[PDB]
Amino acid sequence: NIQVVVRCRPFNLAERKASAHSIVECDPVRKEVSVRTGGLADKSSRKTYTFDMVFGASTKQIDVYRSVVCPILDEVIMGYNCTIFAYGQTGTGKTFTMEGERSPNEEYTWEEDPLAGIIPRTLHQIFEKLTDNGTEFSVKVSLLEIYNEELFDLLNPSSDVSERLQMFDDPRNKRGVIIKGLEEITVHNKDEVYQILEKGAAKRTTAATLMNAYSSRSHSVFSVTIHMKLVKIGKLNLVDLAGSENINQSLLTLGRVITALVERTPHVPYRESKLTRILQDSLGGRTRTSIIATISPASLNLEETLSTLEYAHRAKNILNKP
Ligand SMILES: Nc1ncnc2c1ncn2[C@@H]1O[C@H](COP(=O)(O)OP(=O)(O)O)[C@@H](O)[C@H]1O
Ligand SMILES: CC(=O)c1cccc(C(SCCN)(c2ccccc2)c2ccccc2)c1
Ligand SMILES: [Cl-]
Ligand SMILES: [Cl-]
Ligand SMILES: [Cl-]
Ligand SMILES: [Cl-]
Ligand SMILES: [Mg+2]
């Protein structure tokens, strides 16, 4: 049963200057979000949904990590496969949630930065857990991106981002695919990390000057494979999806895969897109998923917010087999 959580961000300045009202209420204890749908017309209308965890505008980066990821990180160290993806409207915080930011000036080190998000926190903590256990581990990471249904490789040594990968069926495996051409960097220890992400960032920046609406329109899959010793392999995909408001084929297919999965029909159209193929095992496969849905408090965003909470809620019905 894929775990589904909801995080809502603080108003931004733009919103504040617009005198925006909040339409969203977060009750952690009841694990409920409930939205105020009636406007000036009906003041009592509300839509209310129940999720596995709920995180409010107040919620800090460390709280998301603590609640969502450690339980997750603990089953990859046990040799099981774990996806976490971020779903929602452009502007609502899925990048801030999977990656995070760096606090102005210095004031902090990437390892301790408050605005640090999941990927930095997970990577960083995969050694302090495995190093302190004094066992054998090798961790490697890869980061690709889907745009207009073409795969690009942000970690590749090639100096040019626009060189495209290709995908074929794993010669031995049913639900997996192989990405032909995809660089996988070995990460030897904590101090190699920032360096890699900083390079991924730079290539990502170039990608944005090259392609239209690259940030909002593109999917990003950061994978982390861990090797342990009989040997055990843990593997964690951290997926930051394109905006849900939205060439978009991978997003459609994603909907249709879910929708087919919960209505239980015979052919789930995984194949009909790139993302659903890379991610096939994460939807009704043997991977243990989570979906952090991402929403905004403002009244302006109401229609989109329900749309998210609706979509995210159905997903609670999808059943895996780890
Ligand atoms: N939980 C949060 N706390 C503080 N600021 C946030 C939060 N979520 C988003 N923001 C800010 O809102 C803006 C949009 O965030 P971003 O992650 O780029 O959205 P998305 O990636 O889903 O479009 C950024 O300025 C980001 O810093
Ligand atoms: C792929 C990528 O760019 C990335 C992935 C995870 C974290 C980070 C950043 S945040 C990227 C923009 N959202 C970062 C690294 C290097 C320079 C600037 C930022 C990161 C921030 C804080 C702690 C570690 C890493 C970046
Ligand atoms: Cl709240
Ligand atoms: Cl911190
Ligand atoms: Cl094939
Ligand atoms: Cl339902
Ligand atoms: Mg984003």
Coordinates of C-alpha atoms and ligand atoms in Angstrom, one line a residue:
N1 CA 0.0 0.0 0.0
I2 CA 1.9 3.1 -1.1
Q3 CA 2.4 5.5 1.7
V4 CA 1.0 9.0 0.9
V5 CA 1.7 12.2 2.6
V6 CA 0.8 15.8 2.2
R7 CA 3.1 18.8 2.7
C8 CA 1.9 22.4 2.4
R9 CA 4.2 25.4 2.1
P10 CA 4.2 28.8 3.8
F11 CA 2.8 31.8 1.9
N12 CA 5.4 33.4 -0.2
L13 CA 6.0 37.2 -0.3
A14 CA 4.1 37.6 -3.6
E15 CA 1.1 36.0 -1.9
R16 CA 1.5 38.1 1.2
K17 CA 1.5 41.3 -0.8
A18 CA -1.7 40.2 -2.5
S19 CA -3.3 39.9 0.9
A20 CA -3.9 36.2 0.3
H21 CA -6.2 34.1 2.5
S22 CA -5.4 30.6 3.5
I23 CA -7.9 27.9 2.2
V24 CA -6.1 25.0 3.7
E25 CA -6.1 23.4 7.2
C26 CA -3.7 20.9 8.4
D27 CA -4.4 18.7 11.4
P28 CA -1.3 16.5 12.0
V29 CA -2.9 14.5 14.8
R30 CA -6.0 13.5 12.8
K31 CA -3.8 13.2 9.7
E32 CA -6.2 15.3 7.8
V33 CA -6.0 18.1 5.4
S34 CA -9.2 20.0 4.7
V35 CA -9.8 22.7 2.2
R36 CA -12.1 25.6 2.2
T37 CA -13.9 25.4 -1.1
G38 CA -16.8 27.9 -0.9
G39 CA -15.2 31.3 -1.3
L40 CA -17.4 34.3 -0.5
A41 CA -20.4 32.4 -1.6
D42 CA -20.6 29.6 0.9
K43 CA -18.5 29.9 4.0
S44 CA -19.0 26.4 5.4
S45 CA -18.1 24.2 2.5
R46 CA -15.0 22.1 3.0
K47 CA -13.3 19.1 1.4
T48 CA -11.5 16.9 3.8
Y49 CA -9.1 14.1 3.2
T50 CA -7.1 11.6 5.2
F51 CA -3.5 10.7 4.6
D52 CA -0.7 8.8 6.3
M53 CA 1.0 12.0 7.3
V54 CA 0.3 15.7 7.0
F55 CA 2.7 18.5 7.1
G56 CA 1.8 22.1 7.5
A57 CA 3.2 25.4 6.5
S58 CA 5.1 25.4 9.7
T59 CA 6.7 22.1 8.9
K60 CA 10.6 22.2 8.9
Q61 CA 12.9 20.2 6.5
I62 CA 14.3 18.0 9.2
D63 CA 10.7 17.0 10.3
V64 CA 10.0 15.7 6.8
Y65 CA 13.2 13.8 6.8
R66 CA 12.7 12.4 10.3
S67 CA 9.1 11.3 9.6
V68 CA 9.2 10.2 5.9
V69 CA 12.7 9.1 5.2
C70 CA 14.4 7.2 8.1
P71 CA 11.7 4.6 8.0
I72 CA 12.4 4.5 4.3
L73 CA 16.1 4.6 4.4
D74 CA 16.0 1.8 6.9
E75 CA 14.5 -0.7 4.4
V76 CA 17.1 0.1 1.7
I77 CA 19.8 -0.7 4.2
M78 CA 17.9 -3.9 4.6
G79 CA 18.1 -4.7 0.9
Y80 CA 14.7 -3.6 -0.4
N81 CA 13.9 -1.1 -3.2
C82 CA 12.3 2.3 -2.3
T83 CA 10.9 5.1 -4.4
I84 CA 9.8 8.4 -2.9
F85 CA 8.2 10.9 -5.3
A86 CA 7.0 14.4 -5.0
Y87 CA 3.7 15.3 -6.8
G88 CA 2.1 18.7 -7.4
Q89 CA 1.5 22.1 -8.9
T90 CA 4.4 24.1 -10.1
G91 CA 5.5 26.4 -7.3
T92 CA 4.3 24.3 -4.3
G93 CA 7.7 22.8 -3.2
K94 CA 8.5 19.4 -4.7
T95 CA 12.1 20.5 -5.5
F96 CA 12.5 22.2 -2.2
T97 CA 11.2 18.8 -0.9
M98 CA 13.5 16.4 -2.8
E99 CA 16.6 18.7 -3.0
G100 CA 16.3 21.8 -0.9
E101 CA 18.2 25.0 -1.0
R102 CA 21.3 26.6 0.5
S103 CA 21.0 29.3 3.1
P104 CA 22.2 32.8 2.0
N105 CA 25.8 33.7 2.5
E106 CA 27.4 30.9 4.5
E107 CA 26.1 30.5 7.9
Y108 CA 26.0 26.6 7.4
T109 CA 27.7 23.6 5.7
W110 CA 25.8 21.5 3.3
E111 CA 25.7 18.7 5.8
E112 CA 24.1 20.9 8.4
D113 CA 22.0 23.4 6.2
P114 CA 18.4 23.8 7.4
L115 CA 17.0 24.3 3.9
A116 CA 18.7 21.0 3.0
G117 CA 16.1 18.6 1.6
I118 CA 15.9 14.9 1.2
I119 CA 18.6 13.9 -1.3
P120 CA 21.3 15.7 0.6
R121 CA 20.1 14.3 4.0
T122 CA 19.7 10.7 2.7
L123 CA 23.1 10.6 0.9
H124 CA 24.8 12.2 3.9
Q125 CA 23.2 9.8 6.3
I126 CA 24.0 6.6 4.4
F127 CA 27.5 6.6 5.5
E128 CA 27.1 7.8 9.2
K129 CA 24.7 4.7 9.4
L130 CA 26.9 2.3 7.4
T131 CA 30.3 3.7 8.6
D132 CA 29.3 3.5 12.3
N133 CA 28.3 -0.2 11.6
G134 CA 31.8 -0.9 10.4
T135 CA 30.6 -3.1 7.5
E136 CA 31.2 -3.3 3.8
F137 CA 29.3 -0.8 1.6
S138 CA 29.7 0.9 -1.8
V139 CA 27.2 3.5 -2.7
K140 CA 26.6 4.8 -6.3
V141 CA 24.3 7.6 -7.5
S142 CA 22.8 8.5 -10.9
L143 CA 20.6 11.4 -11.9
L144 CA 18.6 11.5 -15.1
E145 CA 15.8 13.7 -16.5
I146 CA 12.9 13.2 -18.7
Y147 CA 11.9 16.0 -21.0
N148 CA 9.7 15.9 -24.1
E149 CA 10.2 12.0 -23.6
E150 CA 14.0 12.2 -24.0
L151 CA 16.4 11.1 -21.3
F152 CA 19.3 13.3 -20.4
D153 CA 22.0 12.5 -18.0
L154 CA 23.0 15.2 -15.5
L155 CA 26.0 13.2 -14.1
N156 CA 27.6 12.1 -17.4
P157 CA 31.2 13.1 -18.1
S158 CA 30.2 14.4 -21.5
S159 CA 30.4 18.1 -21.6
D160 CA 27.1 18.6 -23.3
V161 CA 23.7 17.8 -21.6
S162 CA 21.7 17.5 -24.7
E163 CA 23.3 14.1 -25.6
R164 CA 20.4 11.7 -25.2
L165 CA 20.2 8.2 -23.5
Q166 CA 18.1 5.4 -24.7
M167 CA 16.1 2.7 -22.9
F168 CA 15.6 -1.1 -23.4
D169 CA 14.1 -4.0 -21.4
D170 CA 16.4 -5.6 -18.9
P171 CA 17.7 -8.7 -20.6
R172 CA 17.1 -10.4 -17.3
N173 CA 14.2 -8.8 -15.4
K174 CA 10.4 -8.4 -16.0
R175 CA 9.5 -5.0 -14.6
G176 CA 12.8 -3.2 -15.1
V177 CA 14.5 -1.4 -18.0
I178 CA 18.1 -0.7 -18.7
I179 CA 19.2 2.9 -19.3
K180 CA 21.8 2.6 -22.1
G181 CA 24.5 5.2 -21.6
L182 CA 23.6 6.3 -18.1
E183 CA 26.7 7.3 -16.0
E184 CA 26.7 6.0 -12.5
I185 CA 29.3 7.7 -10.2
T186 CA 30.6 5.8 -7.2
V187 CA 30.4 7.9 -4.1
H188 CA 33.3 6.9 -1.9
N189 CA 32.5 8.9 1.2
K190 CA 30.8 11.9 2.5
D191 CA 33.1 14.5 1.0
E192 CA 32.5 13.5 -2.6
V193 CA 28.8 14.4 -2.3
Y194 CA 28.4 18.1 -2.6
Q195 CA 30.9 18.0 -5.4
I196 CA 28.7 15.7 -7.4
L197 CA 25.4 17.5 -6.7
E198 CA 27.1 20.8 -7.6
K199 CA 28.1 19.4 -10.9
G200 CA 24.6 18.0 -11.5
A201 CA 23.3 21.4 -10.7
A202 CA 25.5 23.1 -13.3
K203 CA 24.5 20.8 -16.1
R204 CA 20.8 21.3 -15.0
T205 CA 21.2 25.0 -15.3
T206 CA 22.4 24.7 -18.9
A207 CA 19.5 22.3 -19.6
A208 CA 17.2 25.1 -18.6
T209 CA 18.7 27.7 -21.0
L210 CA 18.4 25.1 -23.8
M211 CA 14.8 23.9 -23.5
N212 CA 11.4 25.6 -23.1
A213 CA 10.0 25.5 -19.6
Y214 CA 12.5 23.0 -18.6
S215 CA 11.9 23.2 -14.8
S216 CA 8.1 22.9 -14.8
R217 CA 7.9 20.4 -17.7
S218 CA 10.6 17.9 -16.7
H219 CA 10.8 14.8 -14.5
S220 CA 13.9 14.1 -12.5
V221 CA 15.0 10.7 -11.2
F222 CA 17.9 10.6 -8.8
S223 CA 18.8 6.9 -7.9
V224 CA 21.0 5.7 -5.1
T225 CA 22.2 2.1 -5.1
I226 CA 23.9 0.7 -2.0
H227 CA 26.0 -2.5 -1.9
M228 CA 26.3 -4.6 1.2
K229 CA 27.9 -7.9 2.5
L230 CA 26.1 -13.1 1.2
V231 CA 25.6 -9.7 -0.4
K232 CA 22.5 -7.5 -0.2
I233 CA 21.6 -4.6 -2.6
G234 CA 19.4 -1.7 -1.4
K235 CA 18.2 0.8 -4.1
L236 CA 16.5 4.2 -3.6
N237 CA 14.9 6.3 -6.4
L238 CA 14.0 9.9 -5.4
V239 CA 11.7 11.2 -8.1
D240 CA 10.8 14.9 -8.5
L241 CA 8.0 15.0 -11.0
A242 CA 6.9 17.8 -13.4
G243 CA 4.1 20.1 -12.4
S244 CA 0.7 18.4 -12.1
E245 CA -1.0 21.4 -13.6
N246 CA 0.4 20.4 -17.1
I247 CA 5.8 16.2 -24.1
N248 CA 3.5 15.7 -21.0
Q249 CA 3.0 12.1 -22.1
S250 CA 4.9 10.8 -19.2
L251 CA 2.6 12.6 -16.9
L252 CA -0.6 11.4 -18.6
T253 CA 0.7 7.9 -18.6
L254 CA 1.5 8.2 -14.9
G255 CA -2.2 9.1 -14.2
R256 CA -3.4 6.3 -16.4
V257 CA -1.2 3.8 -14.7
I258 CA -2.5 4.8 -11.3
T259 CA -6.1 5.0 -12.4
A260 CA -5.8 1.6 -14.1
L261 CA -4.1 0.1 -11.0
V262 CA -6.8 1.1 -8.5
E263 CA -9.6 0.1 -10.8
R264 CA -7.8 -3.2 -11.2
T265 CA -7.8 -3.8 -15.0
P266 CA -5.7 -6.4 -17.0
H267 CA -3.2 -4.2 -18.8
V268 CA -1.5 -1.4 -17.0
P269 CA -0.1 0.8 -19.7
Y270 CA 3.4 1.2 -18.1
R271 CA 5.0 1.0 -21.5
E272 CA 3.1 4.0 -23.0
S273 CA 5.7 6.3 -21.5
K274 CA 9.4 6.7 -20.4
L275 CA 8.7 7.5 -16.8
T276 CA 6.3 4.7 -16.2
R277 CA 8.9 2.3 -17.6
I278 CA 11.7 3.4 -15.4
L279 CA 9.3 3.5 -12.6
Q280 CA 7.1 0.5 -13.4
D281 CA 8.2 -1.5 -10.3
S282 CA 7.3 1.5 -8.1
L283 CA 3.6 1.3 -9.1
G284 CA 2.2 -2.1 -8.3
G285 CA 5.6 -3.6 -8.4
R286 CA 7.7 -5.0 -5.6
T287 CA 9.3 -1.5 -4.7
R288 CA 8.0 0.2 -1.6
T289 CA 6.8 3.7 -2.6
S290 CA 5.7 6.9 -1.0
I291 CA 4.3 10.0 -2.6
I292 CA 4.7 13.4 -1.0
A293 CA 1.9 15.5 -2.4
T294 CA 2.7 19.2 -2.4
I295 CA 0.2 22.0 -2.0
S296 CA -0.2 25.7 -1.5
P297 CA -2.4 27.5 1.1
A298 CA -3.5 30.3 -1.1
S299 CA -7.1 30.8 -2.3
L300 CA -5.9 31.5 -5.8
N301 CA -4.7 27.9 -6.1
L302 CA -7.8 26.2 -4.9
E303 CA -8.9 24.3 -8.0
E304 CA -5.4 23.0 -8.5
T305 CA -5.0 22.1 -4.8
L306 CA -8.1 19.9 -4.8
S307 CA -6.9 18.4 -8.0
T308 CA -3.7 17.4 -6.3
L309 CA -5.3 16.2 -3.0
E310 CA -7.8 14.2 -5.1
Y311 CA -5.1 12.6 -7.3
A312 CA -2.8 12.0 -4.3
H313 CA -5.7 10.4 -2.4
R314 CA -6.6 7.8 -5.0
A315 CA -3.0 6.8 -4.9
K316 CA -3.6 5.5 -1.3
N317 CA -5.4 2.5 -3.0
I318 CA -2.4 1.2 -5.0
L319 CA -1.1 -2.0 -3.5
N320 CA 2.5 -3.1 -3.9
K321 CA 4.3 -6.5 -3.3
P322 CA 7.9 -5.8 -1.8
Ligands
LIG1 N1 8.1 24.0 2.8 C1 8.6 25.2 2.3 N2 9.2 26.1 3.1 C2 9.8 27.2 2.7 N3 9.8 27.6 1.4 C3 9.3 26.8 0.5 C4 8.7 25.6 0.8 N4 8.2 25.0 -0.3 C5 8.5 25.8 -1.3 N5 9.2 26.9 -0.9 C6 9.6 28.0 -1.7 O1 8.6 28.2 -2.7 C7 9.2 28.3 -4.0 C8 8.8 27.2 -4.9 O2 9.6 26.0 -4.4 P1 9.9 24.9 -5.4 O3 10.4 23.7 -4.6 O4 10.8 25.5 -6.6 O5 8.5 24.4 -6.1 P2 8.4 23.3 -7.2 O6 9.8 22.6 -7.3 O7 7.4 22.2 -6.8 O8 7.9 24.1 -8.4 C9 10.7 28.3 -3.7 O9 11.1 29.7 -3.5 C10 10.8 27.6 -2.4 O10 11.9 28.0 -1.6
LIG2 C1 20.9 17.7 -8.6 C2 21.1 18.9 -7.8 O1 21.3 20.0 -8.3 C3 20.9 18.8 -6.3 C4 20.5 17.7 -5.6 C5 20.4 17.7 -4.2 C6 20.8 18.9 -3.5 C7 21.2 20.0 -4.2 C8 21.6 21.3 -3.5 S1 20.1 22.4 -3.7 C9 19.9 22.5 -5.6 C10 18.7 23.5 -6.0 N1 17.5 23.0 -5.5 C11 22.7 22.1 -4.1 C12 24.0 21.5 -4.3 C13 25.0 22.3 -4.8 C14 24.8 23.6 -5.1 C15 23.6 24.2 -4.9 C16 22.6 23.5 -4.4 C17 21.9 21.1 -2.0 C18 21.4 22.0 -1.1 C19 21.7 21.9 0.3 C20 22.5 20.8 0.7 C21 22.9 19.9 -0.2 C22 22.7 20.1 -1.6 C23 21.3 20.0 -5.6
CL3 CL -1.4 24.7 8.4
CL4 CL 19.5 20.7 9.9
CL5 CL 13.5 -3.3 -25.4
CL6 CL -10.9 7.4 -2.4
MG7 MG 10.5 21.1 -9.3

